[PDB]
């Protein structure tokens, strides 16, 4: 290969246009039906250790 | 660039470095290098014609004469060395210190007494020069300094 190289410096406009796809999506969160805390769905509540109505995990 | 402290080594090869060519870091294109046409110790003196300085001397005194600012004095009655002594005299002679005065006299006691007044420049007549004449608004001279002046412009 012959070492390809940027022909022109990217403008402030183009560099930031490229990053129009970089924003984070916020975490998907739902209230835990036992302790009302916000937690990811289909995961054991990290605050009261409950899942599927029963206690699974010590917290 | 020859009087600067660095060595005459060529900092990197002439060719094939991708960088500009350079010799030694004393060259004036380097920060910290020699300076190209900076000042060197110089003598600014020159021999102005004797007649020209003699003419200027007499003209500069004539100017004050034509203005009414040339005063000649017999002697300095009261003054014997003390600033307040000369001050008393200068008040009797219309020298209140509202105008600057070139005081030309061979009497050193008189010169010692006046030389600290901000409005007075002191000279012995052998030092009479045009710059100090034109510097000052008035010209006060001994008859003994008036005599020296006449002898020099002749």
């Amino acid at each position: 290969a012959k070492h390809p190289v940027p022909k022109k410096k990217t403008s402030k406009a183009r560099r930031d246009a490229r990053r129009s796809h970089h924003a984070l999506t916020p975490p998907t969160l739902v209230p835990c039906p036992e302790c009302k805390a916000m937690k990811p769905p289909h995961t054991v509540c990290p605050e009261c250790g409950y899942y599927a109505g029963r206690k699974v995990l010590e917290v | 660039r020859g009087e600067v402290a660095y060595s005459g080594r060529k900092i990197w090869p002439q060719k094939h470095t991708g960088r500009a060519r350079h010799g030694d870091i004393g060259a004036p294109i380097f920060v910290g290098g020699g300076v190209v046409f900076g000042p060197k110790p110089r003598d600014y003196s020159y021999t102005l014609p004797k007649k020209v300085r003699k003419k200027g001397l007499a003209m500069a005194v004539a100017d004050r004469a034509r203005e009414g600012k040339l005063l000649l004095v017999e002697a300095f009655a009261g003054v014997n060395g003390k600033t307040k002594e000369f001050l008393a005299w200068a008040k009797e002679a219309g020298l209140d210190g509202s105008e600057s005065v070139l005081l030309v006299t061979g009497n050193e006691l008189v010169r010692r007494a006046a030389r600290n007044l901000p409005w007075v420049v002191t000279l012995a007549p052998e030092g009479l020069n045009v710059y100090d004449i034109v510097r000052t608004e008035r010209l006060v001279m001994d008859l003994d300094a008036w005599e020296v002046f006449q002898n020099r412009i002749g």
Binding site: A23, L24, P27, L29 | -
Partner: protein, 112 residues
């Protein structure tokens, strides 16, 4: 009333932590806490600490009520970079910049 915290010289690249700060700008203090707790970014840890600091400033020093607090403004500034050598092939040294961040959070009271 406004209350502010600033974490200065946090040793993390400004571009990375800004992604985290964009999540909570304009958010209520409680939503921001839950958002930061499950953000899979190193910078959630730093942004959380400044958010919690500022909310403690708002309650303890500025007569602001916790349950009214939202992120009225937040932003990341660049601190002085730590420059370090990265050896490369063929006797060449590169300079790696380990960038630093100033992290500002400003809280207000959403009267509702």
């Amino acid at each position: 009333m406004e209350a502010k915290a600033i974490a200065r010289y946090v040793r993390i690249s400004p571009r990375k932590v800004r992604l985290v700060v964009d999540l909570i700008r304009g958010k209520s203090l409680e939503e921001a806490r839950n958002i930061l707790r499950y953000t899979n970014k190193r910078g959630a840890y730093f942004v959380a600490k400044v958010l919690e600091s500022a909310a403690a400033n708002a309650v303890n020093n500025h007569d602001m009520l916790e349950d009214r607090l939202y992120v009225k403004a937040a932003y990341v500034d660049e601190g002085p970079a730590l420059k370090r050598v990265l050896p490369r092939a063929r006797g060449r040294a590169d300079i790696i910049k380990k960038r630093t961040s100033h992290i500002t959070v400003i809280l207000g009271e959403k009267h509702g």
